[PDB]
């Protein structure tokens, strides 16, 4: 099948061009709301802890799938492992509120404490990638623009504060992404890169 | 029917085939590229998902 | 000659299994092949029932 | 993907060695396992390298007979590594020895499996 290059227009050959056959499709795998809905696991701090969704590894299997999208929504749950109450405050809220009991507060209950939440930014989409930041003093020059490319500081769900955290796990619902991104593997030093799959 | 995506081989025993790409003859072309891109097809599937920290 | 390596449900890992047990469902079977009993020494070979 | 060794150098005969083998740390691929199947290989100068052990997955070992019995052989999976054993030490144990695995064809077993390895050399002469 010949064309015209240049026309960046989509165009596909099928094996009937030299005599096969097209079979049967089935793409229940591989579709966003179904691959997305999953926990994932997450570094916690001791007191205080904004819940961000770009705090997953990039590595993992939810973090890079959502990297592959510049803006997305979604709503929350959250699984928490801690010793003593729970409590969760909506965005953009006074860090004084994480004392209050008023505020939505979960008491221990062994062993964890599964909760879900809902959207509350004010936003009507989220960004994984922000152009905001338009781009001797040497090492200053370094650590400003270093620190002055971060996201902007609405991209979140909340806060939530224990007397100590030990575990906290994502799991987003309803996902829907927009404008795809790159998504690499890992490249190989030799021929192939291989795992080594289940065998003796 | 299915095949697996996994095991970078590094080693023998090819499992898939090959494919190769050829020149049969040419007129003054000395030092032209071809670039040459991939994509999937229309009955491309995939299944059984996992997490091997890629 | 063992059998291939694809012949398998999956794997499991913890950090220490001391007990395992499996369960079939919908099973369905093709082609049969010989099943033997213990060979009796004697003219028979008796299990002890129940009975004091 | 690469496996190195350690213990071998200069040494005289009669001594006792341990060659150890410093894996890359078997980066190998899926589930597909219980084909574990290491072994140690010996080459001579312009002579093509000949085999002296190979292990299989659990229990079973075999030797050339021409080391038979003299040698011993085992693996420690618990923490990935395999050895080598050295005792009764004669002037036939001048070759490099190659920390390698094996195929297990039909007829005998088969070599890597692998890209290469670098070896060690226990050449003894009194």
């Known amino acids: 099948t010949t064309s015209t290059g240049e026309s960046a227009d989509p165009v596909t050959a099928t094996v009937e061009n030299y005599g096969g056959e097209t079979q049967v499709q089935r793409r229940h795998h591989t579709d966003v709301s179904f691959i997305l809905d999953r926990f994932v696991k997450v570094t916690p701090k001791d007191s205080i802890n904004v819940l961000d969704l770009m705090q997953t590894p990039s590595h993992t299997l939810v973090g890079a799938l959502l990297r592959t999208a510049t803006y997305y929504f979604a709503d929350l749950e959250v699984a928490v492992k801690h010793k003593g109450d729970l409590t969760w405050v909506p965005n953009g809220a006074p860090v004084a509120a994480l004392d209050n009991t008023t505020n939505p507060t979960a008491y221990h209950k062994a062993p964890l404490t599964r909760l879900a939440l809902p959207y509350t930014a004010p936003h009507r989409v989220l960004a994984t990638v922000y152009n905001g930041k338009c781009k001797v003093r040497g090492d200053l020059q370094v650590l400003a623009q270093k620190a002055a490319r971060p996201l902007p500081t609405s991209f979140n769900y909340g806060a939530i504060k224990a007397t100590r955290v030990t575990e906290l796990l994502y799991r987003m619902k309803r996902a829907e992404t927009y404008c795809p991104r790159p998504l690499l593997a890992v490249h190989p030093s030799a021929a192939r890169h291989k795992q080594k799959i289940v065998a003796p | 029917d299915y095949a697996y995506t996994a095991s970078d081989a590094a080693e023998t025993t090819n499992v898939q085939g090959w494919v190769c790409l050829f020149q049969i003859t040419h007129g003054k072309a000395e030092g032209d590229a071809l670039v040459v891109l991939a994509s999937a097809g229309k009955d491309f599937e995939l299944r059984l998902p996992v997490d091997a920290r890629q | 000659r063992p059998l291939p390596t694809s012949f398998n449900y999956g794997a499991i890992k913890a950090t220490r299994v001391t007990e395992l047990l499996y369960r079939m469902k919908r099973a369905e079977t093709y082609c049969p092949r010989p099943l033997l009993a213990v060979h009796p020494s004697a003219a028979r070979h008796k299990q002890k029932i129940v009975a004091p | 993907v690469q496996l190195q060794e350690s213990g071998g150098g200069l040494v005289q005969p009669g001594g006792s060695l341990r060659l150890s083998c410093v894996a890359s740390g078997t980066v190998f691929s899926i589930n597909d396992i219980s084909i574990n199947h290491l072994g140690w290989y010996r080459q001579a100068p312009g002579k093509e390298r000949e085999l002296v052990a190979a292990?299989?997955?659990?229990?079973?070992?075999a030797y050339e007979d021409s080391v038979k019995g003299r040698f011993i052989i085992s693996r420690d999976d618990a923490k990935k590594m395999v050895y080598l054993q050295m005792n009764s030490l004669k002037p036939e144990d001048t070759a490099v020895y190659y920390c390698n695995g094996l195929r297990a064809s039909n007829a005998g077993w088969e070599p890597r499996f692998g890209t290469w390895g670098q070896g060690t050399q226990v050449t003894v002469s009194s």
């Open positions: 292990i299989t997955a659990d229990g079973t070992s």
